[model samples]
Each structure stands twice: as structure tokens, then as C-alpha cells.
Target: IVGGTSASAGDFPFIVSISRNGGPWCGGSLLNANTVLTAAHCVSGYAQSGFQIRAGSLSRTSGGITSSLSSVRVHPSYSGNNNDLAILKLSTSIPSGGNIGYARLAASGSDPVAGSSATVAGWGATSEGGSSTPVNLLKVTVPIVSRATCRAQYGTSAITNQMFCAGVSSGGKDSCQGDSGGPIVDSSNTLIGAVSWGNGCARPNYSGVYASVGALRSFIDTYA
Candidate 1:
């Protein structure tokens, strides 16, 4: 990561709300008007059913339309490590206008180097292992860290081209648990990544890892 600070929701308007317990929760991003990108962990066993994606909302509490899941295409090899991307199908297309549209998918093969600035947006927990916040959107800016740095942090674990790391060692701003599936967008508002797994929320030596959107463009192209 670049050692830069975390960014806020104003920078990424296409990020969506993911949830369980029949209400607004979790996080996701609109790949198109109807297709939403999220973490496999968000809807793994549910597959095409059992979950909902809320789009076009800045706050998690009110507003925005809900789409009962029509289907989901999880990465075949999704293990929440090497593979973690999942696509949620919506009943209807989100119309263009206002804040209701797809975020720009990152260009293929664009592996941003360490120290580059990237932004993460979510409505998850405020602190690590904490209770989920109610109706408010939270955001943080984190810098990109090298793959080697991430591997060293996790140690002897698999790091795929589909995954990359970011955040600082100072224990400051970062993505936390319950924030899974949020978009890790670049400065240009292009979705370069998605919140995957990390050792802990905002902990030293552990950066937020995300499914690399730029690396897995072909998988995304299937629907695009």
C-alpha cells in the first residue's frame, strides 16, 4: 500500500449495501445496473437465494431499493483466500441518474504498486469485532502494501494475483470486520479491489486484503 490515508464514501458512490438478518448490512458494489460485486463470504451457502443487496443508498438505514436475490455466481475456486469475488443478481435494473449506477471497473492488468492511494467504503462495524453500526456509512483511506509484505504478515499463506493488501502499521484507519465485500476503489472511482480478509481490524502488521478486480477482469467480463 502507499502509506496514504483512507478515503470516504463521497469518493465512491456506486458502493452498495449487503446484509443478513433481513435488513441493510454488509457491503457491495454495483458492477452494472443489475449486477452487484461482493465477497463470497457474504452469500456463500445461500448461493442464488437467501440474501439481499441494497443499492443507491449512502446511509444504511433508509431509502434505496431492495432486490431479492435472483442468482449468484461465486468464483468457482472461492475459498475466501485465493478466490473471494461473487456477483449478486438483482430482480430489476437500477436506473442511471442520481447515485444509482455502476462504478467503473478497474482496467485489466493494472496492478497498482505499493504506496498508491486507494479508498475503502463500508457501513460495517466501527471497531474490530464490534457491533454493527446502525444506519450510518463509514469510510477509511489506506495505502497499498506489497504482496511480500502481506505474505510476511500472514506467513506461509497463499497469496494469489486475485488478492492484494493495503493499510498502515500505525493502527489507525483501515477496514474492519463486518466490512466485508465493500469496494476498495482507486482515486479515479474505478473499483480496483474489494474488502476480503485481514488478520484483524486496524491492527498493526495486518492490512486489509481484497479481491483484485484488475486481475480478475476476465471473470467479470463473463457478465460484462
Candidate 2:
């Protein structure tokens, strides 16, 4: 997260790093002991054997309990990063204690009020287009943008209802490069969205767009 503060260990226990074998690559939200939700783009064209779920950690590369995946499934309709959601079913369930837990998913069609606040956290680059990252987990509070405003800022063809936007209009705070697939949650810590894309990190008027977990609830219900 850019322009964000360091996150305490239990601030987002459900948040986990999506790794390439053992290397940290992206982030995700734990749905249960065995299910993990992330962005489809992160898992596109990758084999389950090549992926790993590292949970119960703050730092990206270490501290977490790592588990191999039993399967990796990307959204069938994912294209151009639109329906960018994925699920990782773990071969072994994470032990139910200490620094690892489940995320409360938003209910179907219950989108957040436009001007309400939500929190997004991750371990990622602090600047746009830079790569020195996987730092300790960080978090930022951003306001949810209305669908109309989001479409206006991004152009009609770019902002879909399947996605939602959250960021300050004057920027300087957001999920930057490498934070993809992490959760953007509501006041109750409900996993309302998943990090998907933005024009750049924390740039004014270029709000971070995320996959609306509410819109994609059916898919998660059926598959996860």
C-alpha cells in the first residue's frame, strides 16, 4: 500500500501472500481454513504445482505457515482483467489459530455506499513503476467511489459494474504495484473487493479499481 501506515499483526489476519512456489508474488484473503480468494490475473497460466499460499504473516517472504494448493481456479469470464477473481483451494487447511483467519465476504448485491470508507492492506511497492517491495504489511483507508463517478473518471468502457473503485480524489494513497489480489474490505472487515487494476499507484483521479466480490458472489458460492 502506498502512502499507508504499517499494519499491526492482527489488523488483517485473513490477508495472505500468494506465492510463486516459495517466492512472494501477490496477496489474497482467506475465506476459510482451506479456501483462498485472490485475483485471477495472478494465477493466469500458472500451474497449481507452481503456486503456494503463505498465511499468518506480516512480512511477505517469511513468518507465515506455507501450504501447497490442491487446485487453482480462475474465473471463466476473466478477460482484460474485468472479472479478475480466483480461488485457491489448499491441499492442507491452515491451523485455526494465531494470525490467520477468515475474511467476511460482502453479501450479494450489497455494494458499499459511494462515500463510505473501506480499508485495503498489502505488502507491496511504495511507488509507481518501482519494484523494491514485499515489505511488511501496510494499510490505507480510502473512500469508495460511486459507479457513475468511477465510470466518468475511467471512461464508460473501462469501469464495469463487476468492479468498484476506492481512493482519494487527490490521491497519494493506494495499492501500488505487486499488491494485486489483496482484499479491500468494509468497516466490518467484509471482503467487498479484491485488488485488480488502476492507471498507476496513488495518482490523483486514478482510483484503484477492484473486483466487486458482491457482483461475483455467485461464482464464489458455486466454486469456493
Candidate 3:
């Protein structure tokens, strides 16, 4: 997220780093001992050979529990930005311990109210157009925008019932590259959204869009 502060190692224990070909590519949240919730784009068409999930740590480069994926399931309607979610099943269940746990999903039919505070954490790039991805985890707080406001800014097509937008009013606080599939949690620490796409990193009038967890609860339960 943009204008975010550094997070301690155990601050977001459910956060995990997804790596492809031995390099960090995206972020995710543990849903259970063997399941991870992430964006479909993060795993679509990628081979499982080099895929790895690193949990239990804030640093992306080292000191985390790692596991290989046994399978991946992307939403059937994952076309473009709509229904952009996926679940990764680990080969072995992660042993729960210090800095290793799972996040609670938002209750079905529950949605975050507009203008409420939400937190997003990840190991994404610190700046727009930057090549370097930080090793340490970072988090930022942003307000959920009203559907009317977000629809006006992103147009109806980009902001749908399956998705919503969140960001700072002045713009400069949002999720960026390497943050896709990360968790967006409300004040109660319930998963509300997944980092999806944006026009640009922290650009004005272009808040980050996410796959609404509450909207897809049934679909997730069917496969997760």
C-alpha cells in the first residue's frame, strides 16, 4: 500500500508471500491450515513446479515457513477484473505456531460500510514506477469509498457488486505491484476484499479495486 508504515514480523501473521520461480510475486492470506486466498491472476496458467507459499514472517526475503502448492483453483468466471480470486491448497498443512495463523473471513451478507477504515498489508513496491520490491512488510489504512463515489471515479464497469474501491481521499495511499491477492480487512479484522487492480499506483481519481470477499463468500466456500 502507498504511504504505508512498516509492520512488525507478527503484526500480520496471516499474510503470506507467494513466489514463482523462487522469486516473490504476490501476497496472500492463509484461510486455513492448508488453504490460501489470493487473486486468480497470481496463479493463472503458472506451473506449480516452482510455486511456493511462505508464511509466518513479515520479511519476504527470508525467515518464513514455506510450502509447495498441491493444487490451485481459480474462480470459473475470472475474466478480466470480475471474480478475480483463487485458492491454493498446500501439499502439507501448515503447523500453527508463532507468527503462523489464519485470517477470519467476513460473515456472509456482511459488507463493510462506506467510509469505514480498512487495513491492507503486503510486501509490494514502495513507490510507483519503482523496480525494487521491499523485503519488509508494510501496511496502510484507507477508507472504503461509497459505491456511488467509486463508480463515478472508476465507471460502473470497473466497480461492480463483485468488486469495490478503497483509498485515501487525497490519493497516495493504496496497494501496488506485488500486493495482488493480499487481504483487505475491516476494523474487526475480517477479510473484506482482495487486492485486485488499479489504474496506477496511488493515482488520483483511481482508487484501488478489490474482489469483494463478502460478495463471493458462497463461491469461496464451495471451493475453499
Candidate 4:
């Protein structure tokens, strides 16, 4: 996280770390006993056998129930700026408990309003390319930027219907590298976005971008 505050294991029960070939790859939100939602770009070039999921862990690598991925479904229309979403089928069913839980998708067409507060939690870097990976999970509350405002900064070609940006105008509090695919939930804990892309970690006037859950709700429902 760009700006951070420590989060306990119980605060993000659905948070899961997605790994590629034994190394930390991205983050995800557990949807059920055997399903995970992530970013298409995170799993784009990897084979199914190389994936692993660690849930209920504050640290990315240790202290959680782990499972290998059985299969994956990437958005067919996924591109650099479109459909940045993916679903994972876990080989083992993850159980719910004090440190583990599931997340609910935001209502269809109910994208979070601009200027509203939303939360993002992850074990990503605190600075771009900096060695500040937190051993415990960290979180930050950011204000959602309107499409018109974001488009004005990133241009229309970059901010698609499937995406939204969130951060302060002064460049702070954002999801950074290693946070990809993690849930960005609304005040009600509804999964409204997923960490996707951005210019830099958290540069001035350049907020972090995320995949809009509402825009991809239909696609997610197909497998969920």
C-alpha cells in the first residue's frame, strides 16, 4: 500500500495471496469454499499447475490454509485496458472460520460513487520498487475518483468502463505492485473493485486504477 495502517487477520478474512510457481504473484478475494477472484493480467501467461492460494494469512507466504488451483477462467475480451478479471477454481475447498471468510460481489451496476470512501488491504510495497513489504497485512482508505476526473488525467482510451481510479489528488494511499487482484471493498464490505493497473504506485494526480466489479458482475456470475 502507498500509505498504510496495519490490519489484523480478522479484518480481511477473505484476503488471499495468489502465487505463481511457489513465488508470491498477486492477491485475491475468496468467493467460496473453492473459488477465488483475481486479475486476468496476474494469471495471463501462467499454467494452471503453477498456481497456489494462501488464505487467512496476514503475511503473504506463511500462516494460512493453502491450496493448488484446479482451473482458471479469464475474460475472453481481456486486453490492456479492458476486462481485467479472472476466476480461479481451487483444488481444495477452503473452510470459513475466525480468520477466514468469503466476500460478496457488489450489486450489478452499483459502482461506488466518486468521492465515496472505500478500503483496500494488501501486502504490497509501500513505495514503488522499494523494499518495504510488510510482514503483516496493511490497509488504506481512499476516495473513489470519478470517471470524468480520471479520464481527464489518463485520457479516455485508458480509463474504460471496466475500470476506476482511487486516491488523493496529492498522490498518497493507493494499491501498489504486488497488490494486484486483491479486493477493494466498499463501506459495506462489498467487493467493488480489484487492484489492476496504474501509472506508478501513487504519483501526483495519478491514482491507482482497479477493475470495476459492477461492470464485470455478469461475467463473474457465470462462474460464481
Candidate 5:
């Protein structure tokens, strides 16, 4: 575990939002000046309805600008097996200041080496049975694992080059549900992964899986 604990709302600056029922829901990262990268499942059935983007504050209740959206682009193959990833283009530019930082571009080429350390953060559900944190960030440290191990555990067909997996098998320190679309930052504090999916919170045979932004750089850049 890296930093799963949410510090003063003042310390976190890269949070964004997705929606359901037209209300703010879920968190994500601004992968570029205008694009926010998050889990496709976050906006899955609501593409036609759309959502908003909020940066510059951790307090979702009274945070920042409620920027409108232009489009929602989910990955072409983002079925549950793929852990679904998608991008939301903001109708307005998010202000860059305070804890509000832009998402660092994903690492280029290959998934991170197995055993490489990484960090993840989100304002998702705090407990396996609880609801998402209203405005607090949840973070955790994780170690990158091999596709072989990931497939063996998650299903041979679920893990793919577009996605990589991480975290502990038995510790309660893994990313749980509702933490999707957050960043899986590497040791260098750079965004290398994007929260995709997992079996559940710290279960015995499960770990958090993410879309390898590094492996999809060309795709990310092609659109951004």
C-alpha cells in the first residue's frame, strides 16, 4: 500500500466526476487538457444523458466548477472482462492550480514490470458494504503482478494486453468496488495505470486490475 488514506481534502487535487441520475458520482483523472479518463462502467448506460467534471477541490459537495460534457467515449472492447475504461471530454477547461493537477500521461510501452510498486487513489466506497466517501479520497499501495498470475486468478480470458493487475491477495489494503476510474500511479508519482476492476476488496485470490495506460498510449494520444 502506497497512500490509500485521504489526507486533508487540501492535499488531493486531481479528482473529477461521473454521473448517474444527473448527480455527481464516481471519481477520475484528467488525462489531458480536456479529456478525463475513468472507468467505462462509470458512465456505461448513461452516455446519452452525460455528466459533469469537477477539478480543483476534494470536497465534491462544494468543490469547483461544474463543467458540462461534450462526449463520453468508452473503449471499444470494454466489456466487464476488460474492466472497462472511457474518456469524457469536458465542455470547459479545468483550472490548473492547488491540489488540482492534470493527470500525468500514462507510461509508454509495456505494462509495468512485475513487482513494481504503484499507488491508487479515489473517493470511492470506504467499506465493502458502505457507500462511496462523500468527499474524501481513499488510497492504497499496490504491487504490479504478471499477466500469467492475473489470468490464473481473474480468468485466463479476462486479463489482456490492454489491462494489467496489482495489489495483495489477502490483505484488506486493496482497492474495492466504486474505486474505479482512479489512477494507479507508479513509484515516480506518474500515472501509469487506470483503475479497471477486481473481484472485490482484499479477497484471498483477488487483486486490483487496471488498464495499462502505458500499453494504450498510442490509443490515448490518438484521441487526446
Candidate 6:
């Protein structure tokens, strides 16, 4: 989470750490007792045995309900950066508790518009070109950019109907490396998108692109 601050415990309980071989590489959201929502690229070509989801904790390393994945389904149309969404089925249902809950995905036609404030939370790098990782979860609020504006900035061919962009034009706040698959939620706490990619993390004139959950509602409904 570039230009983000440490999140308090229980503040964003739905956020989950997606780890590979015990090391966190991405973030995700708990969709239900047995399902997780994330970026398809995060799990592409990865071994299922080494993948795990840790929920209910601000700290990425401990104090969460860790569960092995029973299955991972990346969208069949996913190719390179397009349609970059995935779902993970847990081996067992996570125990129901106060600090562990599921987040609701945005309904169809409920997409966030440009200039709307949205929050993105994750346990990733603090800045571009940084190798350091935060022990605690980090969060940053960024503005949603209109598809027209985003397409102009990223190119017409790059920003697709399945994706949207969010960030500040002056640069500073954004989702960076290791922040993929994290949630980008609206003020009402509706899941709008999942962190997908950005150019060099928080660079001026560049925004973080995300897989538009609202646009992919049908696919998520079928699989999630």
C-alpha cells in the first residue's frame, strides 16, 4: 500500500492475506465462510498446495484464521492483464466470529464514478521500488477515476470494460507491489474492485487499475 497508514485491528476484518509457501504476496477478501475473492494473476500458474488464506488479523504474519485452499478458479478468459479475477475455495469453512466476516460485492450497475472517494487496504509495500513489507495491514483512500479519464491516461486499449482505475493525479496514494487482489471499496463498504496493477506504483499521472467487480458480477455470482 503505497502512501498508506497502518490499519487498526478489526477495522478491515474482511481483508485477507494471500500467501504462497507461508509468505504473503497478495491480498484478498473473504466472500463467505469458504470463499475468497482476489486477482486471477495472483494465483496463475501457482501450486495450489502452497497457497493459503489468512483472515481476521491486522498483522499479516499471525493471529488469523489460516486455511488451505481446496480449489482455485481463475476466470477462463483471463489472459495477461484482462479479466484478472479469481476465487479460492477454502478447505473448510472459517469459524464465524466478530473479527472475521465476509464483504458484499457491488451489485450490477453500482459502479463507483470518478471523483468518488474509495478505500483500499492491504499488507504490501510502502512505496514504489521498496522491498520492505509491513507487519500490520495498511490502508489508503483514493479517488475513483472515470473510465474516460483512465483510458486517456493508460491508453484506450489497456483500460477495458472489465477494469477501472483509481488514484490521485498528483501521485502519492496507491496500491503497490504485493497489494494485488486486495479490495477497493466504496464509502458504503461495497466491494468495487480488486487491485490488479499499476505503473511503477503511485507515479504521477498514473493510477492503479483494478478488476471491476461490478462489471464482473455475473461471473462472480456463478463462481463465488
Q: TM-scores, in order shown?
A: 0.90, 0.95, 0.96, 0.96, 0.87, 0.97
Model 3 global lDDT (CA atoms, 0 to 1): 0.86
Model 2 regions more than 4 Å off:
none
**Tens-place lDDT digits, model 6, residues 93-112:** 88658798888888886667
**Collision pairs in model 5:** 1-141, 2-141, 4-139, 4-140, 13-99, 13-100
Best by lDDT: 6
Ranking of all candidate structures by their TM-score, best first: 6, 4, 3, 2, 1, 5
Candidate 6: segments with Cα more than 4 A from true spot: none
Give one digit per residue, the lDDT tens place, for model 4 in 103-168. 988888877799999999887889988775777788899999998899988998999888988989
- Which residues of candidate 4, in runs, are more than 4 Å off? none
Task: Itemize residue pairs with steric clashes in candidate 2.
Answer: none
User: Model 2, range 82-164, lDDT digits (tens) per residue?
Assistant: 99999889988987588888888899987778889999988778899877774688899999988888888899989887999
The whole-model C-alpha lDDT of candidate 5 against the native structure comes to 0.71
Estimate every model's Cα lDDT from 0 to 1: 0.76, 0.87, 0.86, 0.88, 0.71, 0.89
- Model 1, residue 35: distance off in Å is 0.5
**Candidate 5, which ten residues in sequence have the lowest lDDT sum?**
1-10
- Model 5 bad stretches (over 4 Å): 1-3, 8-12, 22-24, 47-50, 132-134
Task: Give me candidate 2's TM-score against the actual structure.
Answer: 0.95
lDDT of 3 by residue, 160-224 (tens): 78887888767899999989999899987788989999888888877888888998898789877
Sort by lDDT, top down from the best: 6, 4, 2, 3, 1, 5
- Candidate 1 residue-wise lDDT at 193: 86
lDDT of 1 by residue, 107-224 (tens): 8898868998888877776677766464656676778999998888887466777899888878667777667888887877789988888877788888888899989888887864
